[PDB]
């Protein structure tokens, strides 16, 4: 039960085709008629879209006839289901549009909720919808270092959504390249957290948020288009933050948030907790609740690690329809200056500080490293505050010749800059 031919499918108005591709599953979709969207991004008719290693809905705004090709699906297996909660997304979107249009500046919204309530899907959809009717450029702010969006994992980020997302990509789209592309790409501001979970170093996590908030403010001050559009701030699971929600307080202050969106039932203890804690600061009129979003499903860590791997590959080499050429170089041990953040595992208590790394295969082989703008000779306090230039991958550490093979996204020389060891590993 496989097959490599095209198959016709009609999706009813208001239904999702729920797709779940696992690993090496490859799906091609071609729309014949109607309107379908992937997290608010409209598929063009007669154009082929290719998907891989992703779990996502294709939503029918109108009754849609399409053609699909995939050896790992059959007509008797595909899942099509009515979605009853889109109206909540529309109501919220058009309220926000009203603020972008009439208020002195655009709304700055934080989205909060439990594990897999649909915070990131809501964010993506609202960003897509913001482009559609009045050509806004909202800032998408990702505060979940486990979700790779426009960059590699381990980062928080701010990115203006200045043109359509790539409906093919779980990563939403890509950052700028040196050549010609089918879609206009994005220009993100990225801060390196570097660790696998925020509880490995809460202090450093909050440090990154403060650094992002400062440069986000500098952008909004200089950019009237983005300022009028506002910000969509996406957070990690609420269960990952502290009991008293003091991390949310910090996010709200550093990013100048004025609207809060909570994903939960009016009877979840979270609802009253949020009103009691943030109501005196934001005003209860500016705290909204969305019930369960339909279709949203739980993900395991196998699935999260799979999106992370794909995002690392994409950073260096591009995607299926955007082939990029990264650059491999050999360097000596003496050519590299590498630091490592404090963490609970290595240092028992995570602080805002870095320690020097001694070059070993066990330490560095297969590691993603952040490249800063700081001199090699820069002190630790300078390196901590230094903006991120990009990322590199150490594919081989030869102990006997005292040399490394390093992969760069940009062809040319190894940057003469201070670098920071990440917890992420990638084998080609």
């Amino acid at each position: 039960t496989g097959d490599n031919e095209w198959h016709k499918l009609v999706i009813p108005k208001g239904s999702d085709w729920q797709i779940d591709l696992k690993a090496e599953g490859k799906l091609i979709v071609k729309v014949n008629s109607g309107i379908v969207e992937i997290f608010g991004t409209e598929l063009a008719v007669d154009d082929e879209y290719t998907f891989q290693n992703w779990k996502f809905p294709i939503y029918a705004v109108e009754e849609t006839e399409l053609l699909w090709k995939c050896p790992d699906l059959t007509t008797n297996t595909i899942t099509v289901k009515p979605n009853h909660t889109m109206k909540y997304i529309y109501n919220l979107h058009f309220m926000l549009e009203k603020i972008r249009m009439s208020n002195f500046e655009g709304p700055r919204v934080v989205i909060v909720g439990g594990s897999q309530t649909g915070k990131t899907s809501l964010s993506r959809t609202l960003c897509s919808y913001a482009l559609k009717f009045n050509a806004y450029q909202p800032l998408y702010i990702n505060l979940d270092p486990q979700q790779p969006i426009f960059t590699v994992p381990g980062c928080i980020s701010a990115t203006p959504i200045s043109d359509i997302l790539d409906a093919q990509l779980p990563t939403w789209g890509q950052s700028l390249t040196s050549g010609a592309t089918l879609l206009h790409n994005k220009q993100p501001m990225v801060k390196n957290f570097g660790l696998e979970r925020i509880n490995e170093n809460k202090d450093l996590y909050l440090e990154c948020i403060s650094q992002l908030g400062q440069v986000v403010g500098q952008r909004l001050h200089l950019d009237p288009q983005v300022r009028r559009s506002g910000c969509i701030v996406d957070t990690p699971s609420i269960s990952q933050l502290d009991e008293n929600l003091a991390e949310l307080h910090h996010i709200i202050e550093k990013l100048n948030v004025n609207i809060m969106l909570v994903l939960c039932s009016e009877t979840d203890p979270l609802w009253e907790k949020v009103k009691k804690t943030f109501g005196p600061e934001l005003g209860n009129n500016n705290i909204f609740f969305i019930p369960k979003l339909d279709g949203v499903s739980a993900v395991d860590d196998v699935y999260k690690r799979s999106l992370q791997r794909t995002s690392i590959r994409e950073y260096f080499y591009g995607s299926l329809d955007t082939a990029l050429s990264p650059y491999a170089i050999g360097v000596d041990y003496e050519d590299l200056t590498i630091w490592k953040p404090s963490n609970v595992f290595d240092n028992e208590v995570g602080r805002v500080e870095l320690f020097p790394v001694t070059i070993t295969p066990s330490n560095l082989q297969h590691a993603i490293i952040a490249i800063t703008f700081a001199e090699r000779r820069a002190d630790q306090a300078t390196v901590i505050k230094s903006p991120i230039l990009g990322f590199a991958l150490i594919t081989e550490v030869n102990e006997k010749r005292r040399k490394l093979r390093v992969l760069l996204p940009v062809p040319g020389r190894l940057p003469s800059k201070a670098m920071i060891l990440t917890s992420y590993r990638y084998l080609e």
Binding site: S175, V190, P326, L389, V410
Partner: peptide
Amino acid sequence: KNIQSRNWYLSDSQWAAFKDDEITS
């Protein structure tokens, strides 16, 4: 035969002053 690559990111000061209309126009 022609090739392209990923770009480095912009510094804080260059990103703050950057206009996405440069990308899209």
